[PDB]
Amino acid sequence: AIKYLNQDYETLRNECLEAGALFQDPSFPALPSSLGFKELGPYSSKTRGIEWKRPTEICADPQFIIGGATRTDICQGALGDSWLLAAIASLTLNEEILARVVPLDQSFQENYAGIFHFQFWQYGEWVEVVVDDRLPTKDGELLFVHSAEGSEFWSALLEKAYAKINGCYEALSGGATTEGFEDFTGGIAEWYELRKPPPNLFKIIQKALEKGSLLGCSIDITSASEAVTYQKLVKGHAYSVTGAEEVESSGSLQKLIRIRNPWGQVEWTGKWNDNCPSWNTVDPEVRANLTERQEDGEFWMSFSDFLRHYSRLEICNLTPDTLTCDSYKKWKLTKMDGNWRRGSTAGGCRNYPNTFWMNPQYLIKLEEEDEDDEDGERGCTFLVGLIQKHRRRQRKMGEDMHTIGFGIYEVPEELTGQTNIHLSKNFFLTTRARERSDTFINLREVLNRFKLPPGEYVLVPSTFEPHKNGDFCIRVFSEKKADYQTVDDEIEANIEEIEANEEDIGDGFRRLFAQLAGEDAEISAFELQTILRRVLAKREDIKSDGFSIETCKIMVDMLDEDGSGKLGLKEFYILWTKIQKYQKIYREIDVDRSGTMNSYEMRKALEEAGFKLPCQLHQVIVARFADDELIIDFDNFVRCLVRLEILFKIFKQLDPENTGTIQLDLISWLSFSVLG
Amino acid sequence: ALDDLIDTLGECVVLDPMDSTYLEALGIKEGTIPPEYRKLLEKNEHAIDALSSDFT
Amino acid sequence: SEEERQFRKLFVQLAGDDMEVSATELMNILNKVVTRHPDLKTDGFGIDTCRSMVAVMDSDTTGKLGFEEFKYLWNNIKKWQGIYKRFDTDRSGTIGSNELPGAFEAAGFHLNQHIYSMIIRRYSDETGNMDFDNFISCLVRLDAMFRAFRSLDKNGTGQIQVNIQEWLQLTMYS
Ligand SMILES: [Ca+2]
Ligand SMILES: [Ca+2]
Ligand SMILES: [Ca+2]
Ligand SMILES: [Ca+2]
Ligand SMILES: [Ca+2]
Ligand SMILES: [Ca+2]
Ligand SMILES: [Ca+2]
Ligand SMILES: [Ca+2]
Ligand SMILES: [Ca+2]
Ligand SMILES: [Ca+2]
Numbered sequence: 022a023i024k025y026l027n028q029d030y031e032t033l034r035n036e037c038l039e040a041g042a043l044f045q046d047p048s049f050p051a052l053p054s055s056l057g058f059k060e061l062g063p064y065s066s067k068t069r070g071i072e073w074k075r076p077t078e079i080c081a082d083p084q085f086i087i088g089g090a091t092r093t094d095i096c097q098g099a100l101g102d103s104w105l106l107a108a109i110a111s112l113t114l115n116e117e118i119l120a121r122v123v124p125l126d127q128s129f130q131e132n133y134a135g136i137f138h139f140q141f142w143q144y145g146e147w148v149e150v151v152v153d154d155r156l157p158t159k160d161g162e163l164l165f166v167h168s169a170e171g172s173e174f175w176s177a178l179l180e181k182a183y184a185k186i187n188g189c190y191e192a193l194s195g196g197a198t199t200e201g202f203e204d205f206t207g208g209i210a211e212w213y214e215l216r217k218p219p220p221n222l223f224k225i226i227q228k229a230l231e232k233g234s235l236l237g238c239s240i241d242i243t244s245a246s247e248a249v250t251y252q253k254l255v256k257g258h259a260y261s262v263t264g265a266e267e268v269e270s271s272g273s274l275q276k277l278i279r280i281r282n283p284w285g286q287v288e289w290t291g292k293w294n295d296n297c298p299s300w301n302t303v304d305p306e307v308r309a310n311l312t313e314r315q316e317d318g319e320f321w322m323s324f325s326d327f328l329r330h331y332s333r334l335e336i337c338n339l340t341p342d343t344l345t346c347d348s349y350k351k352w353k354l355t356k357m358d359g360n361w362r363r364g365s366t367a368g369g370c371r372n373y374p375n376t377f378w379m380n381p382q383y384l385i386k387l388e389e390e391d392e393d394d395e396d397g398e399r400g401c402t403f404l405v406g407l408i409q410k411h412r413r414r415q416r417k418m419g420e421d422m423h424t425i426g427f428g429i430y431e432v433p434e435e436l437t438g439q440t441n442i443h444l445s446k447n448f449f450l451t452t453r454a455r456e457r458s459d460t461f462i463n464l465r466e467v468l469n470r471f472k473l474p475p476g477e478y479v480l481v482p483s484t485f486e487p488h489k490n491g492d493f494c495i496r497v498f499s500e501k502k503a504d505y506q507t508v509d510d511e512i513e514a515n516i517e518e519i520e521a522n523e524e525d526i527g528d529g530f531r532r533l534f535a536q537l538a539g540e541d542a543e544i545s546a547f548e549l550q551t552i553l554r555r556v557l558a559k560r561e562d563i564k565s566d567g568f569s570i571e572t573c574k575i576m577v578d579m580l581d582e583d584g585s586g587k588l589g590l591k592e593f594y595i596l597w598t599k600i601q602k603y604q605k606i607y608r609e610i611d612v613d614r615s616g617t618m619n620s621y622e623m624r625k626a627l628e629e630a631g632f633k634l635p636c637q638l639h640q641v642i643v644a645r646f647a648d649d650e651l652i653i654d655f656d657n658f659v660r661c662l663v664r665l666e667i668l669f670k671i672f673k674q675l676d677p678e679n680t681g682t683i684q685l686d687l688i689s690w691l692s693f694s695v696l697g
Numbered sequence: 698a699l700d701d702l703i704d705t706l707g708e709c710v711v712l713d714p715m716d717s718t719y720l721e722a723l724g725i726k727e728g729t730i731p732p733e734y735r736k737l738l739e740k741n742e743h744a745i746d747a748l749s750s751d752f753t
Numbered sequence: 754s755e756e757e758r759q760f761r762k763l764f765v766q767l768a769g770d771d772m773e774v775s776a777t778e779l780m781n782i783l784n785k786v787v788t789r790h791p792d793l794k795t796d797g798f799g800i801d802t803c804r805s806m807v808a809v810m811d812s813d814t815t816g817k818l819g820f821e822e823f824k825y826l827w828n829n830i831k832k833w834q835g836i837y838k839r840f841d842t843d844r845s846g847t848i849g850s851n852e853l854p855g856a857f858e859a860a861g862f863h864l865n866q867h868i869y870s871m872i873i874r875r876y877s878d879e880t881g882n883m884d885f886d887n888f889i890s891c892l893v894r895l896d897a898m899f900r901a902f903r904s905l906d907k908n909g910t911g912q913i914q915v916n917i918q919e920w921l922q923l924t925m926y927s
Contacts, residue, residue, distance in 0.1 A: 026813040047821055048813065070742035099734040101724030159737050195725035242721050248728025257721060258729045284731050370715045424717055453713045461717040485717045512917040536698045552699070559703050569801060574875055586874075597705070604706055635918075641925055644816050645808050648800075649777065657801075668924055672917065684914040687902055688868065694898040694924050696871050744767060745782060749789045751831045753838070 022140050022147040030138045030151055043135035046153040049185045057191030058417045073155040080172040083129045087173050093317055094176045096285030098165040102193040103259035106283040107237045108201025111261040115233045122205050139182040142207040144410050144494050145356050150182045188414040198237040198259050200465050202337035209341050213334045223276050223324050227265040228344045235337035236262035253290040270302040278327055282318030293322050341404050341498040351501045357383055358494035358636050362651055365619040369487030376487040378446040381621040383480035391501055392475055401475055402500035406468030407482045410492040424485040426461030428454040432477040441629055444479055461485040514669040515631025526594050534590050543587035546574045564616040565655045572660050603659055606630055618653040630662055764820055773817035776804045794846035795885040802890045808926045809897040833892050836860055848888055850881030862895055894927055
């Protein structure tokens with residue numbers, strides 16, 4: 022798992038029995054802005070009397086878990102994070118996944134300090150987050166989330182761990198349960214309108230539940246006017262589906278289903294509930310194994326009233342497998358992130374052809390042997406999942422989940438033989454999409470299943486309207502036939518280091534070298550700078566800050582094979598051919614003639630230059646060579662392709678036969694990592 | 698001459714409606730926050746010269 | 754215990770209000786401080802070097818420097834400042850060729866003449882002499898790669914091994 026904010030659990034817990042007492046949190050303040058901004062802000066009346074008390078302080082017997090970490094522990098506090106909370110309640114039905122999120126062995130009595138940890142699925146990686154045990158309490162009792170018995174604390178700390186990843190408590194205000202589910206599972210969220218069930222919906226619930234998937238539901242809201250429905254059902258409110266059973270009550274077979282209300286109080290009325298002599302009509306044998314009689318917000322209802330009353334039903338499966346199917350499949354995963362940014366990459370959907378073509382694009386190879394004829398249709402099954410990163414943390418500024426969705430195009434068979442394969446503005450004006458997301462919706466993730474013939478396809482993710490800023494990532498799940506996979510692409514480069522000798526050099530260059538060098542004969546570092554500025558003030562396109570001297574020196578101490586201070590002919594001829602191509606790429610990739618490389622463009626420029634990097638890495642290059650608007654001017658571009666063409670070059674050759682590994686002592690480690 | 702150097706850098710219908718939709722985020726209404734807990738929420742109980750200082 | 758409270762109290766007033774320090778902001782800061790100290794020769798800190806300072810110091814990778822990051826950086830700059838004026842013995846406002854080995858050793862660093870020369874080739878002006886902003890920019894990344902190395906010398910042997918990833922990660926930072 023990746024360590025969130027790069028803090029470690031076991032290097033904190035160690036650092037107490039050597040430091041003193043109980044531990045605060047630099048990463049995540051217990052100061053009055055680790056809470057809210059507006060509606061629960063630093064001084065909206067609402068916020069006051071509130072105190073960060075540890076479990077030791079408001080509870081003689083501070084426990085972590087007691088009577089298992091079960092679903093009766095989770096009970097909503099003063100915040101609208103039912104969505105997430107419902108998610109937690111249904112998590113505890115699987116024991117051994119709860120494991121992953123909750124390291125159950127924590128205490129207050131062992132080698133303890135005040136720090137805690139949880140693991141979370143986050144936009145494609147598993148991430149472990151640490152918090153301190155201090156929690157928001159007012160008066161005696163707890164305020165946000167709280168247990169059944171009031172000296173159990175795990176579920177409240179988890180809540181705090183989920184706010185930390187989201188900036189603050191108030192940000193957790195509202196969303197979908199599947200946001201929670203996936204953040205616990207990394208699973209595949211299938212949805213269902215309860216107006217339009219598929220046939221075996223009821224049998225799906227049972228499969229799902231058996232299959233250890235995650236389930237939850239909710240009645241939606243319509244504009245204009247009050248909350249609670251008079252059968253006692255909370256409107257616009259996350260509930261957690263928990264039990265699936267069909268049992269013949271004297272007369273007819275009964276479809277029944279167990280839900281849980283995250284309040285932990287207020288169960289539904291009128292029909293089939295808890296204090297209802299319809300339970301007279303059922304056999305005691307499986308009855309006294311399945312139905313209780315106490316208010317915990319948990320209850321049953323007919324599948325009929327369940328269909329009548331609930332609007333939405335979200336489900337999270339721990340595989341891309343569908344539950345309509347009854348057999349397990351093999352699946353490859355392909356991950357890719359990107360950004361929309363107004364001006365360069367924020368395109369809108371196809372409804373806006375003037376911009377649409379400036380979103381990022383993504384290849385999708387559906388391959389011959391992965392074809393099946395299943396379900397009548399013949400093709401390759403796959404799943405696209407587009408998901409907004411970190412949207413919940415821009416809630417401070419006011420913003421929220423955009424309206425997202427995607428479209429798929431068939432690359433024409435004449436591009437088939439190509440890497441640089443980008444799709445034109447006019448291309449989208451002459452070609453309908455081949456497949457596409459259901460709609461565009463303002464969910465955090467939109468993901469559907471597809472089946473197309475083997476071939477190459479472009480994936481175009483977008484908001485509905487252009488000019489919307491935001492980051493995303495994509496999960497593509499391929500169905501595969503078990504005779505491959507375990508195959509993992511890796512960081513590779515591709516030099517083109519040729520053209521030594523006079524034969525390959527030219528008499529033009531030969532003659533023109535003589536000119537520019539002047540007296541000192543080899544071209545100095547200060548000389549190459551004069552050159553770079555000239556071109557910089559010649560080329561109309563090619564935005565640049567200017568080429569610094571610290572960079573030119575670097576260019577010499579790269580092609581300075583013989584060793585001397587400066588650049589001789591062959592040495593310079595190579596340098597030029599290299600700047601020539603860095604330029605051809607920059608040109609060819611700069612399809613909006615900004616004269617600059619945006620995120621996506623960079624990724625494509627690096628690829629055209631031979632490098633093959635993981636997302637983590639592209640994302641470092643960007644974060645390091647890019648200005649605030651997330652863009653790279655020509656000089657940074659060269660600096661970047663230079664540095665990298667060196668790092669790789671230095672790796673190979675220090676590792677000639679491809680032991681994926683290399684070894685360095687201190688002094689020379691400095692001398693590579695800082696210079697030559 | 699330098700001019701001559703720089704020259705070496707490269708010589709000189711159908712609509713397809715996409716429909717959208719809007720889904721209300723859950724629990725963004727205060728009517729959804731517990732009664733027992735709604736209770737609690739009311740009630741009630743120069744710039745850079747100090748850096749210069751570090752040099753001399 | 755005491756100076757921190759009265760230090761943090763005003764890290765904020767220039768952190769902006771995303772609470773973290775930007776490369777542009779870091780620039781702005783520094784250039785504001787040198788002009789008040791004209792006895793340290795410099796052409797000023799350019800954006801690109803403030804980017805890498807933030808890069809190598811950023812370490813929770815929030816892309817910007819929070820308190821413990823900013824504090825650490827500053828504390829070093831301040832150490833290296835006194836080291837500048839001290840080992841600048843001809844009062845030029847630059848560390849010259851011969852002054853260099855003195856100061857770096859003094860900054861805890863231990864090199865050969867070979868390394869020193871090349872440093873001087875890459876970071877010094879024409880005459881061998883070396884600016885202030887350059888001297889700082891330089892020590893920041895010596896300090897980085899030195900801790901990074903440390904952070905892997907678990908064998909204590911003064912000898913670490915890394916793979917393609919790690920290599921790039923730790924060096925795509927200059
Ligand atoms: Ca329990
Ligand atoms: Ca009940
Ligand atoms: Ca010359
Ligand atoms: Ca630049
Ligand atoms: Ca040479
Ligand atoms: Ca561009
Ligand atoms: Ca800032
Ligand atoms: Ca930081
Ligand atoms: Ca001097
Ligand atoms: Ca300088």
